[PDB]
Amino acid sequence: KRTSIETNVRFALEKSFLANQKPTSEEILLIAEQLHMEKEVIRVWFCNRRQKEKRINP
Amino acid sequence: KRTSIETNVRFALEKSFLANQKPTSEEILLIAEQLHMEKEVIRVWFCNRRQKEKRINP
Amino acid sequence: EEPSDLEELEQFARTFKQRRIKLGFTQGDVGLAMGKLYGNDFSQTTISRFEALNLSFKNMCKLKPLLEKWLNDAETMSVDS
Amino acid sequence: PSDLEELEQFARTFKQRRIKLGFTQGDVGLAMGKLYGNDFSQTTISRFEALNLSFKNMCKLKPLLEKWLNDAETMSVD
DNA sequence: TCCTCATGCATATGCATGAGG
DNA sequence: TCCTCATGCATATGCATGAGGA
Ligand SMILES: [Br-]
Incomplete structure (x- = not known):
C-alpha cells in the first residue's frame, strides 16, 4: 500500500518544507488542500523529510 | 571491482553518443583511454545506450 | 509496427x-507466478519495465500475451473468492 | 579520530x-541474523554504506558489521 | 494526536550476461 | 566481447509502519 506523487506536486510540497520545516496539523491540511494528496500522505512526507535532514549525508 | 560512472563522465559519454551512436572498437579504446576506463565498460555502455534508445519509452 | 498496436500496448x-x-500482487509476485504458470520465471525488473514500456516493441508484444493469461486467470479467481 | 571520521572511514x-568478499547488501543482513540473532534488510545496509542513517544508528550498527567482517574475511584461514 | 526514530517493502534502474547472428 | 536482443542481479530510494515520547 503506497501512494505516489506525480513530480511537480513534490516540488511545491518541497517548497512548503523549505518555508516551514515543522508545520502544525492545520498547515499540513491546507497544504494538502492546495496540492490534492490526502492529509496523512502529507503528515508522513514531512516526517521523512525531517528524518532525512537529520542524517550524516543528506 | 564494480564499475560506476562519474556523473560528469556520464555526460561526456552521452555527448559522444549523440555525435556517434555506434563507435568502432578502435574509437572505444580511445574513449576508454581518454577517460582511463576499461574498454569493456565503455563497450557495454554504448550497447546499453543503443538498446535503451530502441525502447517505446527510453 | 502500426500505431494502433502501440496504443494497444499503452492501454x-x-x-x-x-x-x-487492485488484486494485491507485487511485481515480484507476478514474476514468480508465471514461472509456475508457464514454466519460465520472470524477474521483478522485467515486470517493472513492462508496466512502463521500458522495452522494445518486439519485447512488449511477446510478453503481453503471457502476462495477459496470468491476469485473466487471476481476475476470475478473485471473483470466485 | 573525531569519531564521525571514524564512522565515515x-x-x-x-x-x-x-x-571484495563478493557479498551483496542483502547477504550481509541475513548472515548477521543467523550469526548474531537480529537480521537486517538490504535497505538498512545500503543506507549504512552511504551514511544515510543517524549518527546514533550508525554507531549501533558498526560493531555488528565489525564482528561479521572478522568472520567473513577469515573463511579460508585454517 | 501529532511528533521522533529505527526500519523496510516495493519499485526503478545502472551495469551486466549470454545466446545467437 | 564485436553486434543485437531478451533478461536480470544488485542497488538506491520513495513511501510507509509502529513503537514510544511529548
Ligand atoms: Br571523449
Missing part, C-alpha cells in the same frame, strides 16, 4: 498495473 | 571490503 500496460495493484 | 572501508 494494456496501464490496465495490467491497476489490476495487479 | 569504517563505512567506506566496509563497502569495499564487502564487495
Whole structure:
C-alpha cells in the first residue's frame, strides 16, 4: 500500500518544507488542500523529510 | 571491482553518443583511454545506450 | 509496427498495473507466478519495465500475451473468492 | 579520530571490503541474523554504506558489521 | 494526536550476461 | 566481447509502519 506523487506536486510540497520545516496539523491540511494528496500522505512526507535532514549525508 | 560512472563522465559519454551512436572498437579504446576506463565498460555502455534508445519509452 | 498496436500496448500496460495493484500482487509476485504458470520465471525488473514500456516493441508484444493469461486467470479467481 | 571520521572511514572501508568478499547488501543482513540473532534488510545496509542513517544508528550498527567482517574475511584461514 | 526514530517493502534502474547472428 | 536482443542481479530510494515520547 503506497501512494505516489506525480513530480511537480513534490516540488511545491518541497517548497512548503523549505518555508516551514515543522508545520502544525492545520498547515499540513491546507497544504494538502492546495496540492490534492490526502492529509496523512502529507503528515508522513514531512516526517521523512525531517528524518532525512537529520542524517550524516543528506 | 564494480564499475560506476562519474556523473560528469556520464555526460561526456552521452555527448559522444549523440555525435556517434555506434563507435568502432578502435574509437572505444580511445574513449576508454581518454577517460582511463576499461574498454569493456565503455563497450557495454554504448550497447546499453543503443538498446535503451530502441525502447517505446527510453 | 502500426500505431494502433502501440496504443494497444499503452492501454494494456496501464490496465495490467491497476489490476495487479487492485488484486494485491507485487511485481515480484507476478514474476514468480508465471514461472509456475508457464514454466519460465520472470524477474521483478522485467515486470517493472513492462508496466512502463521500458522495452522494445518486439519485447512488449511477446510478453503481453503471457502476462495477459496470468491476469485473466487471476481476475476470475478473485471473483470466485 | 573525531569519531564521525571514524564512522565515515569504517563505512567506506566496509563497502569495499564487502564487495571484495563478493557479498551483496542483502547477504550481509541475513548472515548477521543467523550469526548474531537480529537480521537486517538490504535497505538498512545500503543506507549504512552511504551514511544515510543517524549518527546514533550508525554507531549501533558498526560493531555488528565489525564482528561479521572478522568472520567473513577469515573463511579460508585454517 | 501529532511528533521522533529505527526500519523496510516495493519499485526503478545502472551495469551486466549470454545466446545467437 | 564485436553486434543485437531478451533478461536480470544488485542497488538506491520513495513511501510507509509502529513503537514510544511529548
Ligand atoms: Br571523449
